[PDB]
């Protein structure tokens, strides 16, 4: 039962609430290590927790690899977004983070630590604003500002540290020295004046990807991403990721989960309790699979429940009710299908002859109220009203799950095993365009006219 429930606080094997906010993860040996921080009664840095696991669902407490006791300046301060990277050369784990006074946010500096072991007590080194010796001044103080940050290890073995500089208006990508504990140079300035936060740096197939968020404090916002063949330059424009609120979360880290089947990239986020006036420690977590339609096209779907099999390297949606269905039109006798049985995103929904194929099989996932999610079997995509249309003739497609109302459907029994399936957005029914009785008939959205081309029978298979 490797299933995770988003919008909640995961519990460790001990039965206690996991506290690793703004955290990250590292895969070393046979274990996945989850690091993170958590405030105390005075909303100050208490400790940087560390959880260990092989299945990625059941987590074991391993103590605080870093504490407010680890150093004198760690006593009364703010530490957030701690990340851990491994060095092949040295063989020691280097840890980076964001340091603040605990009185204000004027000291936008990075902090470093390290340990010979992953779950061992780390030894704090120092806090500093990158390029302090260069003499450069960034808003009153010497050295580039460094708030929201993240780490990345390239294929060539070069370490990288990224953080928001120039008043969180610019992103700075710093190249680390071979030891990962210091900054060698300023690799590049990314997305200047665009004010991107909570950056996540990853790589797939000679393509670098930078998942960022907006700057709106606790309030969830529109996450975006970009790609490039080179870290120095060639970066693309920002492309929207997830919905307008990134599913009520903020991106924190993205790691590749490799297994026997292949590689699935896991997305980690934080549902900051600050949104509803709660303390940081009451923040919940949101984990989702990061899918790659193409080298340039990324997808971040929201599943209220996610199934993970770290062994096989598969991250997909968890369907509570695996019961398969066919939707048969009353007038045509054809069933709900996907054009050319495609698994592509935004593929047109059409009616077709009952041929017992996969594309014609659908799950039904309850989502509260009288509404439900109609999910294709061959492709985990959901029945979607294109562009959230509210008009007659609005085409229906299969699209990535995004919690949108244009993906919620209510079934209304009209008798004899037939239903009127109305959208939650406007209330219009699933309709076969022009009463079509042939294969490939376009499935659309239309007002309840009482026609038989709007009546569908639910048939178990």
Q: Domain with 144 in it: what CATH number?
A: 2.115.10.20
Domain termination site, one of 265, 288, 321: 321
Measure the CA–CA gap between 379 and 301, rounded to whole angstroms: 13
Q: Are 329 and 459 members of one domain? A: yes
Please report how many Cα atoms fall inside a 13 Å half-sphere around the Cα of residue 441, on the Cβ side. Answer: 24
Residue 387 marked as a ligand binder? yes
Residues 55 and 128 in one domain: yes
Task: Say yes or no: 174 and 54 in one domain.
Answer: yes
d(Cα 91, Cα 94) in Å, to the nearest integer? 10
Which of 253, 255, 236 is CA-nearest to residue 191? 236
Distance CA 418, CA 309 (A): 38
Query: If we measure between CA atoms, which residue out of 56, 47, 43 comes closest to residue 19?
Result: 47
Q: Is 344 annotated as a binding residue?
A: no
384: annotated binding-site residue? yes
Same domain as 335, residue 431: yes
Q: 275 and 397: one domain?
A: no
Beta-ladder partners of 126: 112
Domain identity same for 187 and 87: yes
Looking at 321, 352, 387, the residue that finishes a domain is 321
User: How was this model experimentally determined?
Assistant: X-ray
The boundaries of the domain holding residue 425 are 322-461
Question: Do 316 and 335 share a structural domain?
Answer: no
Same domain? 125 vs 49: yes
- Residue (of 72, 136, 128, 62) closest to 97 by Cα position: 128
Q: Do 239 and 332 belong to one domain?
A: no
Q: What is the 3-state secondary structure (H, E, C) of the chain?
A: CCEEECCECCECCCCCECCCEEEEEEEECCEEEEEEEEECCCCCEEEEEEEEECCCCCCEEEEEEEECCCCHHHCCCEEEEEEEEECCCCCCEEEEEEEECCCCCCCCEEEEEEECCCCCCCEEEEEECCCCCCCCEECCEECCCCCCEEEEECCCCCEEEEEEECCCCEEEEEEECCCCCCEEEEEEEECCCCCCEEEEEEECCCCEEEEEECCCCCCCCCEEECEECCCCCCCCCCEEECCCCCCCCEEEEEEEEECCCCEEEEEEEEECHHHHCCCHHHCEEEEEEEEECCCCCEECCCCCEEEEECCCCEEEECCCCCCCEEEEECCCCCEEEEHHHCCCCCEEEEEECCCCCHHHCEEEEECCCCEEEEEECCCCCEEEEHHHCCCCCEEEEEECCCCCHHHCEEEEEEECCEEEEEECCCCCEEEEHHHCCCCCEEEEEECCCCCHHHCEEEEEC
Task: Determine whether 294 is exposed, middle or buried from the number of CB atoms within 10 Å of its CB (0-12, 13-18, 19+).
Answer: exposed
- Residue 253 has φ and ψ, to the nearest 5°, of -170, 150
User: Looking at the structure, do residues 279 and 399 belong to the same domain, yes or no?
Assistant: no
> With contact defined as beta carbons under 8 Å apart, do 249 and 269 qualify?
yes
The count of structural domains within the chain is 2
């Amino acid at each position: 039962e490797g299933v995770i429930v988003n919008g909640t606080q995961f519990k460790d094997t001990s039965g206690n609430v996991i506290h690793a906010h703004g955290g990250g993860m590292l895969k070393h040996g046979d274990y996945y290590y989850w690091y993170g921080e958590y405030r105390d009664d005075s909303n100050l840095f208490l400790g940087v927790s560390c959880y260990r696991s092989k299945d990625l669902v059941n987590w074991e407490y391993r103590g605080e690899v870093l504490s407010r006791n680890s150093a004198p300046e760690l006593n009364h301060c703010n530490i957030e977004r701690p990340k851990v990277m491994y060095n092949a050369s040295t063989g020691e784990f280097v840890m980076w983070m964001h340091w603040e006074n605990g009185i204000n946010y004027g000291q936008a500096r990075a902090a470093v630590a390290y340990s010979k072991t992953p779950d061992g007590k780390f030894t704090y080194i120092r806090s500093f604003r990158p390029m302090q010796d260069t003499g450069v001044m960034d808003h009153g103080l010497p050295g580039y500002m460094s708030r929201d940050c993240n780490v990345f290890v390239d294929t060539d073995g070069k370490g990288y540290f990224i953080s928001a500089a120039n008043e969180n208006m610019d992103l700075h990508l710093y190249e680390l020295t071979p030891d990962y504990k210091n900054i060698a140079s300023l690799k590049a300035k990314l997305f200047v004046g665009q004010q991107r936060e909570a950056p996540c740096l990853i790589k797939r197939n000679g393509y670098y990807y930078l998942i960022t968020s907006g700057c709106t404090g606790w309030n969830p916002n529109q996450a975006k991403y970009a790609y490039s063949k080179d870290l120095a330059s060639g970066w693309s424009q920002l492309y929207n990721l997830g919905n307008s609120t990134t599913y009520r979360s903020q991106p924190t880290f993205i790691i590749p989960v490799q297994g026997s089947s292949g590689t699935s990239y896991l997305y980690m986020g934080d549902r900051w309790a600050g949104a509803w006036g709660g303390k940081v420690n009451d923040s919940q977590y949101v984990w989702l699979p990061l899918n790659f339609i193409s080298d340039t096209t990324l997808e971040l779907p929201y599943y209220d429940s996610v199934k993970i099999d770290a062994s096989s390297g598969i991250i997909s949606e968890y369907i509570p009710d695996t019961t398969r269905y066919k939707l048969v039109n009353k007038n045509s006798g054809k069933v709900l299908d996907v054009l050319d049985g495609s698994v592509d995103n935004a593929a047109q929904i059409v009616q077709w002859t009952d041929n017992g194929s996969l594309s014609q099989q659908w799950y039904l996932v309850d989502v509260g109220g009288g509404y439900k999610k109609i999910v294709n079997v061959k492709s985990g995509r959901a029945l979607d009203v294109k562009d959230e249309s509210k008009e007659d003739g609005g085409v229906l497609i299969q699209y990535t799950s995004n919690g949108g109302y244009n993906q919620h459907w209510k079934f209304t029994d009209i008798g004899d095993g037939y239903y009127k399936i109305s959208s939650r957005h406007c209330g219009k029914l699933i309709d076969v365009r022009k009463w079509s009785t042939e294969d490939g008939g376009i499935i659309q959205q239309w007002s309840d006219a009482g026609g038989t081309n709007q009546h569908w029978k639910l048939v178990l298979v």
